[PDB]
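TEACHING EXERCISE
Course module: macromolecular assemblies
Task: Read the component lines below, then compare them to the predicted structure of the full complex.
Student: A.B.
Group: 4
Components provided:
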Amino acid sequence: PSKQEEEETYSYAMQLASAIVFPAVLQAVIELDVFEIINKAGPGAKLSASEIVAQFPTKNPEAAATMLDRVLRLLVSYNVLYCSLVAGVRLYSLAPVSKYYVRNQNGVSLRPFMNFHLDKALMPCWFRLKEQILEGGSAFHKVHGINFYDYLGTDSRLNEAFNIAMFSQSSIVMDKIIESYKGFDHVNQLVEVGGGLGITLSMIISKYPHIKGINLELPHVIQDAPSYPGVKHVGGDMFERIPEGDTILMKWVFIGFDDDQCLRLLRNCYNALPVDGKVLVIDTLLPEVPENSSASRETSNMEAIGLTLVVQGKLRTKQELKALAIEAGFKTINFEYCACNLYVTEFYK
Amino acid sequence: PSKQEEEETYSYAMQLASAIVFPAVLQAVIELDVFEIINKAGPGAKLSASEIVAQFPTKNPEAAATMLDRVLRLLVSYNVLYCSLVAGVRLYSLAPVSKYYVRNQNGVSLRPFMNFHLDKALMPCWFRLKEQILEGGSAFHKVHGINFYDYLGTDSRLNEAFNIAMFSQSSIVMDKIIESYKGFDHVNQLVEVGGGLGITLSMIISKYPHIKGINLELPHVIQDAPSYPGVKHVGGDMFERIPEGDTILMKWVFIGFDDDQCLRLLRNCYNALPVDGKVLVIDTLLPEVPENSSASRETSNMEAIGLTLVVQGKLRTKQELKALAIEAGFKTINFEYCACNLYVTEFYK
Ligand SMILES: C[S@@+](CC[C@H](N)C(=O)[O-])C[C@H]1O[C@@H](n2cnc3c(N)ncnc32)[C@H](O)[C@@H]1O
Ligand SMILES: C[S@@+](CC[C@H](N)C(=O)[O-])C[C@H]1O[C@@H](n2cnc3c(N)ncnc32)[C@H](O)[C@@H]1O
Ligand SMILES: COc1cc2c(cc1O)[C@H](Cc1ccc(O)cc1)NCC2
Ligand SMILES: COc1cc2c(cc1O)[C@H](Cc1ccc(O)cc1)NCC2
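Instructor-supplied answer key:
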């Protein structure tokens, strides 16, 4: 239908045939510090490819500038950069989505998050999904012979790379969640299970300094975590024991586990909480239907990552989460959307 | 910047951090024959993930259908498939773009074209663009110590993969080009340089049976080329000599060469043509501005594949092609948009 629409469909089909190049181009530009260079130049700066290349460690800036101008035009057509023309020369500025890959005040961005999925330890795993669907099991396990968190405890390089990737995504999002979710008035001893390096707790204690915090984590994660104020790092296993407190918190944890792991975990929360304790679960809820939206696209990608790394896991619906709580001991359950495609799921005991 | 805009920007930024999973997923689904399976069922058919897995060699259809429903939800988010909910069951149908990856009457689709970009010899090349922007040169040459087309004369597996990739793409578009471009009246002897396996000449000769056709091409390409009536496969080199004809044809050839190579090539064309000869160059022109369109994303994807495989090449504007015509001796130049993001540039002698 329609010649305009039929041409758009042909081009999208061609776009899909070579969509492997977009991650490769995005990573190369980002890791050439191009977004840092445009950003440092000042608020709303517009820099030519020749200007940007002046700051590269290159012995042939002529070739680099002609090469770079091609991939910067690519990022413009994918809405990552803006373009302005001054005498037939193209001047590029940061578009909204690029600011998530510019280092902020502390030097944090989504860069180590994107670079984790492009790691040499993970790249061959994405492309064994056909074998995984047909033969069951896990792509990550097919490639490495050990499951995901188990493998991390054997490779410090990838453990560290994963940890910075979680750390970076957490810092970027918790500022918007903390501003959305006003539910720490009745928190005094917060316990975060599978909290990574510790930044989620630290940022809650920074806005709510009455809170003391415990970070329950596997020991290979907490090995050299920073010594945040009011944060105690505890090395154990949330399927064995959870330290005692009045509130338990879980971000990007519940989605990694099957129903039987999830119930053993919520019963350990129940036993660690007091008669009025509560559990907080920060996660995306499973959408009832996929759709053509970047939220839906973000969610599906996460689903695909989960399939590849921890097949056991799943994104769950409201009804799936409520029933898991009730069987574990909890009485009340609430769902509060807290921005960034994320909910806070409250299991009141 | 509304809160909806700020939310869409975050979700896009998250989509970009994991954009490597989309090629992996589109490939795994295409190679499980899912687009064939839904297509067999009839125009507009909506199948459940369990119906689809009925035709897999899986040995565990239940795990297969769980896993497959996650990746099919992904393709619905990226507008490759449709999803309809019936009695709480998700039924998937083919969206217009997926039709390009369903084998047609002759068994051709963009499947081997996409699969070429995911080849084990091309994959390490895409993710070296930072190293090649800094040091100049070709990522392909850096990975495979020979330039692109010369390596093809050394790797019979990759030669076939590539030749089929070009065969598939030209079959798709050549029907629409011929339908839009009536500039083949008058032509008697058509010489096509870099014609590949020859399906594009064959197709022209099928609607214009009067035309005789020469397919000047590298020996390792025409070695096992098909035999089309009215098409003579000539092993050679367009930079040494182009056989005489009243019309010369180039598709996806010119963009692979720097300005000096194009002048030598156009000189050879000028000397092979009669007083009223003409050269036809089928190629995407360089757009003056990148835009947010699948057209411009397709164009940019190609510019980046160019950087990775043959750095010296370039897409060119009308003024740049005009200047190369004049320098080579041609009298008139014309530009006619055909279809499929392609132009015919006519060099008139
Ligand atoms: C994907 S991460 C989430 C990290 C952090 N919550 C965030 O959102 O950035 C899941 C974390 O849970 C931790 N984890 C997994 N199993 C665990 C267990 N049995 N006991 C303690 N921690 C565990 C992992 O080490 C990992 O860092
Ligand atoms: C990308 S392809 C285009 C194939 C075909 N025109 C199409 O569009 O499907 C470029 C072709 O030009 C051929 N080629 C490259 N250099 C050549 C030369 N010096 N003489 C003849 N053919 C050449 C290559 O073998 C390759 O098949
Ligand atoms: C979006 O990027 C990641 C997100 C997460 C992880 C890894 C990533 O690369 C790991 C494994 C996992 C991923 C997805 C899923 O559905 C379940 C578990 N844990 C939690 C979320
Ligand atoms: C879209 O996919 C391909 C298109 C083409 C080729 C390889 C691909 O993978 C080869 C190398 C090349 C690619 C791009 C470019 O700008 C110049 C040369 N020749 C012509 C067109």
